[PDB]
Amino acid sequence: GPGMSSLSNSLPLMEDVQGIRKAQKADGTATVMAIGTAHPPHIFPQDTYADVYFRATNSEHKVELKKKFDHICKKTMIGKRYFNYDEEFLKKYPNITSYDEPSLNDRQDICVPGVPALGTEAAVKAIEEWGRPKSEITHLVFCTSCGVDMPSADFQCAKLLGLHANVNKYCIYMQGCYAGGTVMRYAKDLAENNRGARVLVVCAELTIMGLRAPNETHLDNAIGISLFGDGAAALIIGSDPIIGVEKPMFEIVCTKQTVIPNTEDVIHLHLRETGMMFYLSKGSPMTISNNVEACLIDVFKSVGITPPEDWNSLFWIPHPGGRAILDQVEAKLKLRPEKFRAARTVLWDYGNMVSASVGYILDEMRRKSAAKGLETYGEGLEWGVLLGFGPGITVETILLHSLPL
Amino acid sequence: LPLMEDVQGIRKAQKADGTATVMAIGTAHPPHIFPQDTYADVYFRATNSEHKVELKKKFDHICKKTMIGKRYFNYDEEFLKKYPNITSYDEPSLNDRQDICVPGVPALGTEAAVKAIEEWGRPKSEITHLVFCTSCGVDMPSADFQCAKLLGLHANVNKYCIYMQGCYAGGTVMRYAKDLAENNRGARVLVVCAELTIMGLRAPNETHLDNAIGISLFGDGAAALIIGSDPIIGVEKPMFEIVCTKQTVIPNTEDVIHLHLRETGMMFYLSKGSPMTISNNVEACLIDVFKSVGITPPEDWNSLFWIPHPGGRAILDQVEAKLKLRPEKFRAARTVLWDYGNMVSASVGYILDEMRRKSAAKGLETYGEGLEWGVLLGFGPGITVETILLHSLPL
Numbered sequence: 001g002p003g004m005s006s007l008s009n010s011l012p013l014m015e016d017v018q019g020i021r022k023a024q025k026a027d028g029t030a031t032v033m034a035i036g037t038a039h040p041p042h043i044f045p046q047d048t049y050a051d052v053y054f055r056a057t058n059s060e061h062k063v064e065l066k067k068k069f070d071h072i073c074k075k076t077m078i079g080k081r082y083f084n085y086d087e088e089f090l091k092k093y094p095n096i097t098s099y100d101e102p103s104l105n106d107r108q109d110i111c112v113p114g115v116p117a118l119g120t121e122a123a124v125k126a127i128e129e130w131g132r133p134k135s136e137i138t139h140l141v142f143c144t145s146c147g148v149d150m151p152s153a154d155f156q157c158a159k160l161l162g163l164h165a166n167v168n169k170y171c172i173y174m175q176g177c178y179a180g181g182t183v184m185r186y187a188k189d190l191a192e193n194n195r196g197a198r199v200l201v202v203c204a205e206l207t208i209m210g211l212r213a214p215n216e217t218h219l220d221n222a223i224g225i226s227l228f229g230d231g232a233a234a235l236i237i238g239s240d241p242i243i244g245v246e247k248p249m250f251e252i253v254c255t256k257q258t259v260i261p262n263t264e265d266v267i268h269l270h271l272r273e274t275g276m277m278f279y280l281s282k283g284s285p286m287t288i289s290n291n292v293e294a295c296l297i298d299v300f301k302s303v304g305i306t307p308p309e310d311w312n313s314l315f316w317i318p319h320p321g322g323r324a325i326l327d328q329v330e331a332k333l334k335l336r337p338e339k340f341r342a343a344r345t346v347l348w349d350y351g352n353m354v355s356a357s358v359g360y361i362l363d364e365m366r367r368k369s370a371a372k373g374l375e376t377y378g379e380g381l382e383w384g385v386l387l388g389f390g391p392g393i394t395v396e397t398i399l400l401h402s403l404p405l
Numbered sequence: 406l407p408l409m410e411d412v413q414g415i416r417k418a419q420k421a422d423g424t425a426t427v428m429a430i431g432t433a434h435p436p437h438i439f440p441q442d443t444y445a446d447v448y449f450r451a452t453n454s455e456h457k458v459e460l461k462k463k464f465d466h467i468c469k470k471t472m473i474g475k476r477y478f479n480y481d482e483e484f485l486k487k488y489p490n491i492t493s494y495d496e497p498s499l500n501d502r503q504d505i506c507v508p509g510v511p512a513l514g515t516e517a518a519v520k521a522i523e524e525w526g527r528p529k530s531e532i533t534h535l536v537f538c539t540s541c542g543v544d545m546p547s548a549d550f551q552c553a554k555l556l557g558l559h560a561n562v563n564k565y566c567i568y569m570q571g572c573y574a575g576g577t578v579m580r581y582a583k584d585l586a587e588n589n590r591g592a593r594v595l596v597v598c599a600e601l602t603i604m605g606l607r608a609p610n611e612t613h614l615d616n617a618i619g620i621s622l623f624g625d626g627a628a629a630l631i632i633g634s635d636p637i638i639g640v641e642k643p644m645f646e647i648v649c650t651k652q653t654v655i656p657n658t659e660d661v662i663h664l665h666l667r668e669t670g671m672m673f674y675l676s677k678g679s680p681m682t683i684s685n686n687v688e689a690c691l692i693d694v695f696k697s698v699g700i701t702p703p704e705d706w707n708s709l710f711w712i713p714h715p716g717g718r719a720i721l722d723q724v725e726a727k728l729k730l731r732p733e734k735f736r737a738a739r740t741v742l743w744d745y746g747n748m749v750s751a752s753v754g755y756i757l758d759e760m761r762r763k764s765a766a767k768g769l770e771t772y773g774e775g776l777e778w779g780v781l782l783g784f785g786p787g788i789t790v791e792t793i794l795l796h797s798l799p800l
């Protein structure tokens with residue numbers, strides 16, 4: 001345990017700066033001890049998505065574009081997605097279902113209170129699994145690329161959960177698809193540098209912020225709409241787990257963010273009067289794959305560990321940005337076909353939930369490992385990596401150590 | 406691959422020993438000077454609201470009460486003529502504001518960063534973390550990415566983008582920097598706070614008088630700091646140790662200060678009771694930050710040095726009165742409010758810079774006005790208070 005009340009960890013009686021620092025910092029590695037997930041109620045099957053999307057956006061007359069989009073939908077390897085809207089809800093907003101009519105205000109009115117609400121649902125489940133009082137949460141890391149406001153989404157989530165007035169909040173806005181890795185990076189330093197600290201990480205996304213009508217000259221926008229789904233993932237992270245009360249699963253050993261040079265125009269999103277405008281180059285799977293190995297070598301060398309000769313020796317939580325990203329990263333690292341199974345299962349059942357996807361995969365991995373009676377939460381293996389990929393191109397590389405079952 | 410018993414050894418080697426310390430401060434502002442005495446004339450002319458005589462009389466009075474002498478902006482009257490939508494009240498303007506703020510904020514921030522890194526004296530290759538802060542403009546990839554790119558930092562610098570945290574954000578960056586520097590051996594954190602207020606500029610309205618109050622206060626500016634634990638003797642210049650950092654939300658006060666990003670840009674809302682909410686709850690935040698580190702709060706608040714966010718003259722007046730402080734205690738804050746206005750997240754950095762510069766010039770015992778302990782305070786939307794406990798070092 002943290003030993004907050006122990007003599008060895010007590011604060012100095014005199015105003016000793018270094019003595020305060022020694023008492024204030026935690027001892028061990030930041031550890032994931034609970035994972036909760038949530039999604040909105042409306043089920044959108046991928047086999048009928050081309051029909052639903054083209055009908056809802058008054059685009060069924062674009063016959064050749066529909067056939068092209070139906071092909072893309074089959075190639076996504078997504079079976080279903082969840083949204084906070086149905087066809088009836090979209091009829092109230094003809095501006096959102098158009099291509100470029102003014103729509104930010106309406107999207108903000110939905111996303112500003114909606115994202116913290118969805119995130120709170122995942123947080124309640126994470127707090128329940130953890131089992132300790134919500135008043136003992138000292139840090140809140142909220143993450144979303146859907147909606148911005150002052151006071152921010154972290155404030156709203158804290159209010160809905162009824163967290164202490166003195167909770168240290170962090171609002172990670174618009175960090176896209178790498179954000180699920182960014183939250184682990186934040187949580188690591190926050191938990192490790194503060195004795196007794198328990199960090200609640202919340203990643204929540206409502207993709208209606210980027211929904212619009214398909215366009216022939218902006219084909220990449222429709223491709224993004226075939227991938228993005230709504231969802232929320234929440235995690236409780238803390239150093240020095242209390243034996244018999246908390247359940248330590250994954251230790252966050254090293255966390256580094258890397259930018260791939262000369263690739264700013266590969267994945268970029270802009271918040272305009274028409275909402276979030278998405279742009280994607282055909283070169284994203286190959287750009288990520290050609291640079292992922294260098295990111296892994298960096299994360300291992302930064303902690304003095306010799307990079308494994310075989311990448312199959314590790315467990316993996318890669319962000320399912322697209323099926324081709326998963327396929328090409330797998331091929332470059334010479335990984336066996338089942339190494340990314342947890343990621344492919346989540347992509348199938350939930351789609352690309354932006355920052356929430358990796359939390360869902362980490363949940364799937366630990367649940368399947370326990371269900372099969374494996375040795376550790378990380379597929380029976382000791383070391384692994386969580387990867388976030390997004391705008392920049394930016395790669396978040398999170399080195400994890402799994403504890404035994 | 407190492408064993409289960411080796412994970413703690415990795416953690417021991419990875420963490421820093423001492424307290425996060427401010428070792429360099431750099432500041433920057435755009436070139437266009439707008440004196441406060443003539444602001445009523447300039448603002449009402451640029452927004453074509455010269456027919457609203459009764460509202461101009463009220464605005465001129467507010468400008469005289471602000472205790473701001475001048476402000477700096479990235480625009481002049483000629484620049485504003487190219488954007489009639491920004492100078493109106495509710496015409497669509499977000500796209501144009503984003504086109505200015507998205508590349509402009511990291512550009513201004515980089516200018517301040519260059520000055521901070523130059524003072525620090527070590528190679529830019531030694532910067533391991535970047536904390537960028539702004540309430541003006543949002544984009545993917547974010548302002549942190551753009552700043553790192555402009556400075557030409559390493560590809561693997563850990564970046565933190567603090568978007569839309571308002572006037573308390575200058576305190577938030579110190580809170581972030583503390584944990585980043587202290588939990589990582591050899592880590593050097595570059596903190597950058599930059600704001601371009603054109604994101605909230607609009608025409609005055611009688612039904613929205615609180616927006617006019619905001620336009621009389623906000624000015625453009627940037628502040629940058631280098632923060633790190635375990636200062637290198639003879640190379641680095643350690644100034645302020647970040648001992649304790651706490652964020653507090655004052656309950657039932659969400660409607661006091663709130664801003665919304667709409668199709669018309671940033672819409673500002675302010676209740677007339679903001680100085681009261683801040684002043685009546687500030688002492689409790691101070692007792693809390695001292696108790697958190699086991700230090701008995703001083704019986705006299707004049708025993709500490711102060712870096713309060715100059716949200717407005719009345720906020721400074723009421724906090725001064727509640728803490729029973731002598732007029733010279735907020736000297737650094739009042740000089741910055743006068744010379745630069747309210748630069749949002751950048752203001753506290755400017756005050757900390759002014760404090761250490763004047764302390765060095767007067768030959769005082771420490772960088773914190775010759776005193777040992779002090780507090781940096783951020784106040785903003787929520788109402789949220791960022792309380793940063795600092796221990797200053799000798800010259």
Ligand SMILES: CC(C)(COP(=O)(O)OP(=O)(O)OC[C@H]1O[C@@H](n2cnc3c(N)ncnc32)[C@H](O)[C@@H]1OP(=O)(O)O)[C@@H](O)C(=O)NCCC(=O)NCCS
Nearest residue numbers: 075076177219220223267280281282284321322323324325
């Ligand atoms: C979208 C995806 C699932 C389609 O699978 P696929 O195996 O590449 O399918 P196909 O090769 O049959 O191609 C489908 C059509 O889309 C095109 N396409 C794919 N990505 C495209 C993009 N970003 N922009 C424009 N066209 C694109 C191909 O050019 C092709 O059509 P064409 O023959 O008319 O030239 C796959 O490309 C992918 O996973 N991309 C990564 C997506 C991503 O980047 N996600 C993260 C961004 S936040």
Ligand SMILES: CC(C)(COP(=O)(O)OP(=O)(O)OC[C@H]1O[C@@H](n2cnc3c(N)ncnc32)[C@H](O)[C@@H]1OP(=O)(O)O)[C@@H](O)C(=O)NCCC(=O)NCCS
Nearest residue numbers: 470471572614615618662675676677679716717718719720
């Ligand atoms: C704006 C300020 C400098 C004016 O100084 P002041 O000493 O209070 O001036 P006065 O009392 O003479 O008042 C000026 C007029 O503005 C009014 N006023 C002040 N703040 C107001 C607000 N937020 N909304 C509407 N009216 C406001 C008074 O009601 C008064 O007019 P009245 O006679 O019609 O009733 C001062 O109120 C202040 O510093 N407020 C805090 C500013 C702030 O909130 N900053 C944070 C922005 S996030």
